[PDB]
Write an enzyme that holds these catalytic residues in place. Structure first.
Site, PDB file in Angstrom:
ATOM      1  N   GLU A 212       0.817  -1.212   0.000  1.00 29.99           N
ATOM      2  CA  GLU A 212       0.000   0.000   0.000  1.00 29.99           C
ATOM      3  C   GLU A 212       0.853   1.266   0.000  1.00 29.99           C
ATOM      4  OE1 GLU A 212      -3.093   0.784  -0.399  1.00 29.99           O
ATOM      5  OE2 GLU A 212      -2.868   2.902   0.128  1.00 29.99           O
ATOM      6  N   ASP A 221      -7.060  10.090  -1.362  1.00 31.22           N
ATOM      7  CA  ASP A 221      -7.010   8.759  -1.958  1.00 31.22           C
ATOM      8  C   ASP A 221      -7.657   8.766  -3.342  1.00 31.22           C
ATOM      9  OD1 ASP A 221      -9.744   8.876  -1.447  1.00 31.22           O
ATOM     10  OD2 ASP A 221      -9.762   7.224  -0.011  1.00 31.22           O
TER      11      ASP A 221
HETATM   12  O1  LIG Z   1     -11.295  -1.501   3.808  1.00 34.10           O
HETATM   13  C1  LIG Z   1     -10.512  -1.511   5.019  1.00 34.10           C
HETATM   14  C2  LIG Z   1      -9.398  -0.440   5.055  1.00 34.10           C
HETATM   15  O2  LIG Z   1      -9.643   0.602   4.041  1.00 34.10           O
HETATM   16  C3  LIG Z   1      -8.837   1.797   4.095  1.00 34.10           C
HETATM   17  O3  LIG Z   1      -7.528   1.548   3.479  1.00 34.10           O
HETATM   18  C4  LIG Z   1      -7.534   1.245   2.033  1.00 34.10           C
HETATM   19  C5  LIG Z   1      -8.249   2.297   1.154  1.00 34.10           C
HETATM   20  O4  LIG Z   1      -9.676   2.293   1.312  1.00 34.10           O
HETATM   21  C6  LIG Z   1      -8.096   2.061  -0.347  1.00 34.10           C
HETATM   22  O5  LIG Z   1      -8.420   3.290  -1.013  1.00 34.10           O
HETATM   23  C7  LIG Z   1      -6.705   1.607  -0.779  1.00 34.10           C
HETATM   24  O6  LIG Z   1      -6.767   1.086  -2.111  1.00 34.10           O
HETATM   25  O7  LIG Z   1      -6.231   0.580   0.085  1.00 34.10           O
HETATM   26  C8  LIG Z   1      -6.111   1.007   1.449  1.00 34.10           C
HETATM   27  C9  LIG Z   1      -5.256  -0.046   2.170  1.00 34.10           C
HETATM   28  O8  LIG Z   1      -4.437  -0.816   1.260  1.00 34.10           O
HETATM   29  C10 LIG Z   1      -9.053   2.147   5.574  1.00 34.10           C
HETATM   30  O9  LIG Z   1      -8.952   3.610   5.909  1.00 34.10           O
HETATM   31  C11 LIG Z   1      -8.285   1.253   6.515  1.00 34.10           C
HETATM   32  O10 LIG Z   1      -8.139   1.841   7.801  1.00 34.10           O
HETATM   33  C12 LIG Z   1      -9.230   0.060   6.519  1.00 34.10           C
HETATM   34  O11 LIG Z   1      -8.761  -0.999   7.370  1.00 34.10           O
END
Ligand SMILES: OC[C@H]1O[C@H](O[C@H]2[C@H](O)[C@@H](O)[C@H](O)O[C@@H]2CO)[C@H](O)[C@@H](O)[C@@H]1O
Ligand code: CLR
Ligand code: CLR
Ligand code: CLR
Ligand code: CAU
Ligand code: PLM
Length: 442
Positions: A212, A221
């Site tokens: 990530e 994001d």
């Molecule tokens: O769905 C659980 C988690 O989602 C976020 O992190 C994601 C994000 O939504 C997404 O845009 C991206 O592609 O991936 C990241 C993580 O790889 C949350 O804010 C996390 O706190 C959650 O656990």
């Protein structure tokens, strides 16, 4: 016959040029760029100096000695040249051994990767390396402890145009063990423990940090939402100050949008905790998660991080096969997803992790682990280049003249040539690569 000499001379001349150029470039880069001024690179500099002296003081005369088929520089320099030769080789492996011990304590320290040594302590260690190396190289050669007592050697010692390194067996054993084999065995053993430790550091934090990415400053994001760290969502509000408010409330201080790596790890451990609780609440994910080992649980959490529980719960067939430990078949189905179509590299690593149940897909992804591999390549290359030569030293103590003089000489030059490889190996580093191309007017 004679034209061969010129052609062989030009080749050896390029060898000398290669050694001197590259090692000058390494010394310059570390001495010039503050970024590169680390404890490790101080040892590298010491290593580069030994190779630089090889290229200036040792290799040129060894080359001439071969091409002229006799020594022209006299007995004094022959003895001096021989001392430098042994010194530089000794100092090189001793330095490499110090790097290995330094890296072990660095990677096992709670202050990870920081050397336990200061810059000044490092210079003292370096200085002590060259003193010890000189004490073990110059002393026996200048005190004539090395010399053999048979006539063929005695003739060579006395005649000014002969510079063959005839030694007595006691020296051949003792010197090669103390100068080479002792720091070699320690180096290999210790740095194998470094790799074990490096591999042992791999966990779900590093996994998601690789997959990530860790961001220290607030960013939007894909959905335009304010996010920080390893994909930690702050708020769905368009107000930046609203995100900062949530960030401060989460971290526990006025951040102004910026957090440390360790604080991102803190948030991440909470997100992982949240993900697991949600998984255990999900009727479709709970049986799968319950059945999986720790490593593959991290893989499932990785997916939940990326797609959420719903997106992961949709892999009905894959989840079933994972639950039955049918890894390859789960891998086949997982590879046929929109997930794999959009983020293939990441999907490739997670799926492979589902296949093996190890962290092997996340080996040497971290910049710090890549750096460890670079050092390991430096050490391995030195070993492979010099080991044949030093094996023959011992073999000839057992039974002399078993291997031709020309082969022994060639094995020496494989050792000599190694002095020009390290600068090329350092191009693996993004920092040196940037440093070099600056210095080379690019
Ligand atoms: O769905 C659980 C988690 O989602 C976020 O992190 C994601 C994000 O939504 C997404 O845009 C991206 O592609 O991936 C990241 C993580 O790889 C949350 O804010 C996390 O706190 C959650 O656990
Ligand atoms: C007798 C002759 C042939 C051998 C030459 C000895 C030279 C190459 C040795 C002797 C003392 C050594 C140094 C000792 C102290 C350090 C400090 C470190 O920050 C960089 C390397 C450096 C500067 C060493 C490099 C090379 C060095 C200068
Ligand atoms: C011994 C003879 C035959 C070979 C020539 C010796 C040269 C290559 C050695 C001797 C002393 C060495 C230096 C000693 C001091 C340091 C400071 C360090 O920050 C960068 C390298 C530097 C500048 C060394 C580079 C090369 C160096 C000048
Ligand atoms: C007798 C023989 C060995 C001497 C040959 C010395 C050669 C290798 C020396 C002499 C002049 C040197 C260069 C002089 C100018 C610079 C620019 C600097 O930013 C990086 C190194 C660089 C590019 C030097 C590297 C190597 C260099 C070319
Ligand atoms: C032309 C010859 C002089 N070159 C020697 C090698 O490069 C380096 O050889 C050594 C390096 C370090 C320790 C050593 N002990 C020895 C015993 C016999 C021969 C070489 C070495 C030796
Ligand atoms: C950007 O840094 C690249 C330009 C550097 C050019 C410097 C000119 C060097 C001249 C080399 C000649 C020395 C040869 C010595 C042989 C004994």
């Amino acid at each position: 016959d004679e034209v061969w000499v010129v052609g062989m001379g030009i080749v050896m001349s390029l060898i000398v040029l290669a050694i001197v150029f590259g090692n000058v470039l390494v010394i310059t880069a570390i001495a010039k760029f503050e970024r590169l001024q680390t404890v490790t690179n101080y040892f590298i500099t010491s290593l580069a100096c030994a190779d630089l002296v090889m290229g200036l003081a040792v290799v040129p005369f060894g080359a001439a000695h071969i091409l002229m088929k006799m020594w022209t520089f006299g007995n004094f320099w022959c003895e001096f040249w021989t001392s430098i030769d042994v010194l530089c080789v000794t100092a090189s492996i001793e330095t490499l051994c110090v790097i290995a011990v330094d890296r072990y304590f660095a990677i096992t320290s709670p202050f990870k990767y920081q050397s336990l040594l200061t810059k000044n302590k490092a210079r003292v260690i370096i200085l002590m390396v060259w003193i010890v190396s000189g004490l073990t190289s110059f002393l026996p050669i200048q005190m004539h402890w090395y010399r053999a007592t048979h006539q063929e050697a005695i003739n060579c010692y006395a005649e000014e145009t002969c510079c063959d390194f005839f030694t007595n067996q006691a020296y051949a054993i003792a010197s090669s063990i103390v100068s080479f084999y002792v720091p070699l065995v320690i180096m290999v053993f210790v740095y194998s423990r470094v790799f074990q430790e490096a591999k042992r550091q791999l966990n779900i934090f590093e996994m998601l940090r690789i997959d990530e990415g860790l961001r220290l400053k607030i960013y939007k994001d894909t959905e335009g939402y304010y996010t920080i760290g390893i994909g930690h969502l702050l708020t769905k509000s368009p107000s930046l100050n609203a995100a900062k408010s949530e960030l401060d409330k989460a971290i526990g201080r006025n951040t102004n949008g910026v957090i440390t790596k360790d604080e991102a790890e803190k948030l991440f451990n909470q997100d992982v905790d949240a993900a697991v609780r949600g998984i255990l609440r999900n009727a479709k994910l709970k049986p799968v998660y319950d059945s999986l080992d720790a490593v593959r649980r991290a893989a499932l959490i990785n997916m939940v991080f990326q797609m959420g529980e719903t997106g992961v719960a949709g892999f009905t067939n894959s989840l079933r096969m994972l639950q039955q430990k049918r890894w390859d078949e789960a891998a086949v189905n997982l590879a046929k997803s929109r997930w794999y179509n959009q983020t293939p590299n990441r999907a490739k690593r997670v799926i492979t992790t589902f296949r093996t149940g190890t962290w092997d897909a996340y080996k040497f992804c971290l910049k710090e682990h890549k750096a460890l591999k670079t050092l390991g390549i430096i050490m391995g290359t030195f070993t492979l280049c010099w080991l044949p030569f030093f094996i023959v030293n011992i073999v000839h103590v057992i039974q002399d003249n078993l291997i031709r003089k020309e082969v022994y000489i060639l094995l020496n030059w494989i050792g000599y040539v190694n002095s020009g490889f390290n600068p090329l190996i350092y191009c693996r580093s993004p920092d040196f690569r940037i440093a070099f191309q600056e210095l080379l007017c690019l």
